[PDB]
Amino acid sequence: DGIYAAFDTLMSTAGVDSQIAALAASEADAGTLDAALTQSLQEAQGRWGLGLHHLRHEARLTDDGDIEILTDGRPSARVSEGFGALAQAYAPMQALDERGLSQWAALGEGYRAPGDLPLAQLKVLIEHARDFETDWSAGRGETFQRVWRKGDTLFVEVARPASAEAALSKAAWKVIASIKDRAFQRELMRRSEKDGMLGALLGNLAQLPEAHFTVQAFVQTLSGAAARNAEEYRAALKTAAAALEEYQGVTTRQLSEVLRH
Amino acid sequence: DGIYAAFDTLMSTAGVDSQIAALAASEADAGTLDAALTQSLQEAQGRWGLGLHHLRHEARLTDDGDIEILTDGRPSARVSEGFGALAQAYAPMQALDERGLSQWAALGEGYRAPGDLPLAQLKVLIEHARDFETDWSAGRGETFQRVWRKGDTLFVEVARPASAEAALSKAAWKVIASIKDRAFQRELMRRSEKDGMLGALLGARLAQLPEAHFTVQAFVQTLSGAAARNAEEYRAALKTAAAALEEYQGVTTRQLSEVLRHGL
């Protein structure tokens, strides 16, 4: 239904198939739906790239038929408010450097190992340290990555910073190149010289979550004895990168089919 | 295809239709050609944004059928050495700040008035001073601008510095769009997501490319006689030259494009 379908819509900009409207239609119970909405919000958060791993993200159902999104137990926003408001709630919590990567430690304030360590030193932290966290390191294909352990869990992030407007602007690259009417094409090209590619194309998205959230990162997790295993980290690092290029590819494509429709 | 077409190709890079190949073939008179090379060469220098207004530019025919490019009467390059050769002959002579603007005065060493002068004060200079020169200021449209007078001629320069790389990039986009075979278009568009754009378009086939070394970065409007001492003639001069610079940028981008479609 309305709120459920909208939440769903938001999760999709992070490649999360939360299926919530169907769960609600299944006559699922309040706590079940809450668990499901919260679980999906956490996945999305790890792919949105906001750099907020240190906050706890919950989402709950309201008696007035809303969904209330929360971060560290404080009410941040309600789905019924629109996604741009969800954006504007997150913003002052964030801290991007000029590379658009999060300046926060996932573990909260403290020491961070450098991102460029030798596998031998990294292998020792994995095996024999409790909690640890490294900084960003430049990887294959303009991507960035960092590793950190919290409790029984190892986290691998692989990121490729690209704003929502960036994501839209690469979608306008493909929509213009695809156009079968060379008159409208050349006209949009001149108007693209003068207002960028997206503005030219626009001449309602504000309401679409694609305007405020896009896929920017992928987090891969290990648990138990895997989270103390150096072969398991390197598999997981490769996994997360493939995943990242996948979901960024899907979302570029689905966002193109939107920019036309 | 001959040294005249070589010179004609080099002049197209500033959007100067020299018509040298057609003159050389016409029934015109002896010596009219050297004059034409120099006339066409000086105009080209106004648009290249090299910052060499203080030097004198000449082009002549040599004894062995070549075209010699001169600076202050000294042999700087030969057209037959290609255009890159001309680029590095100019290089030791240049002096660009961080933005792409010449640090040389157009009038040689001497006092330069501020570039951010008030219009009432720039006017006095335009109505009553003899020779003068301002520094670069910014203008409208992410442009820059300065103005000098040498003699009876006012010189209004508007500039939008660009690397010949980005200009080649902008011409690649225009071409990969006009592409007819939608399959190869999507192939190029995907490589362009990976290997860059002008990268992936060159990859289907440049230092020989004239536009690889020279680009329209600026334009100099000129006033003479009575207009040259007229402050409203000056403010209009500035709008003309920004419009010019957009035009010749557009002409030279459409040219470089039609060049990139050959060899696909």
From Swiss-Prot, chain A:
The lineage of its organism: Bacteria, Thermotogati, Deinococcota, Deinococci, Deinococcales. This is DNA repair protein PprA. Changing S102A: Slight decrease in phosphorylation. Lack of phosphorylation. GO terms for molecular function: damaged DNA binding; double-stranded DNA binding. The PprA protein combined with an immunofluorescence technique can be used to visualize radiation-induced DNA strand breaks in mammalian cultured cells, allowing the evaluation of DNA damage responses. This detection method could also be applicable to genotoxic tests in the environmental and pharmaceutical fields. Phosphorylation increases DNA binding affinity. It comes from Deinococcus radiodurans (strain ATCC 13939 / DSM 20539 / JCM 16871 / CCUG 27074 / LMG 4051 / NBRC 15346 / NCIMB 9279 / VKM B-1422 / R1). dsDNA-binding protein that contributes to the ionizing radiation resistance of D.radiodurans. Plays a role in DNA repair and genome reconstitution, and is necessary for recovery from severe genomic fragmentation as a result of exposure to severe levels of ionizing radiation. In vitro, binds to double-stranded DNA carrying strand breaks and stimulates the DNA end-joining reaction catalyzed by DNA ligases. Thus, PprA plays a critical role in a non-homologous end-joining (NHEJ) pathway for the repair of radiation-induced DNA double-strands breaks. The gene is pprA. Signal peptide: none annotated.
From Swiss-Prot, chain B:
Induction: Induced to high levels following extreme ionizing radiation exposure. Also highly induced in response to desiccation stress. GO terms for molecular function: damaged DNA binding; double-stranded DNA binding. The modification Phosphothreonine is found at T62, T134. GO terms for biological process: cellular response to desiccation; cellular response to gamma radiation; DNA repair; double-strand break repair via nonhomologous end joining. Disruption phenotype: Cells lacking this gene show a reduced growth rate, do not exhibit a decrease in the efficiency of natural transformation, but are much more sensitive to ionizing radiation than the wild-type strain. This is DNA repair protein PprA. Phosphorylated by RqkA in vitro. Phosphorylated primarily at Thr-62, and to a little extent at Ser-102 and Thr-134. Keywords: DNA damage, DNA repair, DNA-binding, Phosphoprotein, Stress response. The modification Phosphoserine is found at S102. It comes from Deinococcus radiodurans (strain ATCC 13939 / DSM 20539 / JCM 16871 / CCUG 27074 / LMG 4051 / NBRC 15346 / NCIMB 9279 / VKM B-1422 / R1). Changing T134A: Slight decrease in phosphorylation. Lack of phosphorylation. The keyword Ligase does not apply. Changing T62A: Strong decrease in phosphorylation. Lack of phosphorylation. The PprA protein combined with an immunofluorescence technique can be used to visualize radiation-induced DNA strand breaks in mammalian cultured cells, allowing the evaluation of DNA damage responses. This detection method could also be applicable to genotoxic tests in the environmental and pharmaceutical fields. Phosphorylation increases DNA binding affinity. The keyword Amino-acid biosynthesis does not apply. dsDNA-binding protein that contributes to the ionizing radiation resistance of D.radiodurans. Plays a role in DNA repair and genome reconstitution, and is necessary for recovery from severe genomic fragmentation as a result of exposure to severe levels of ionizing radiation. In vitro, binds to double-stranded DNA carrying strand breaks and stimulates the DNA end-joining reaction catalyzed by DNA ligases. Thus, PprA plays a critical role in a non-homologous end-joining (NHEJ) pathway for the repair of radiation-induced DNA double-strands breaks. Coiled coil: none annotated.
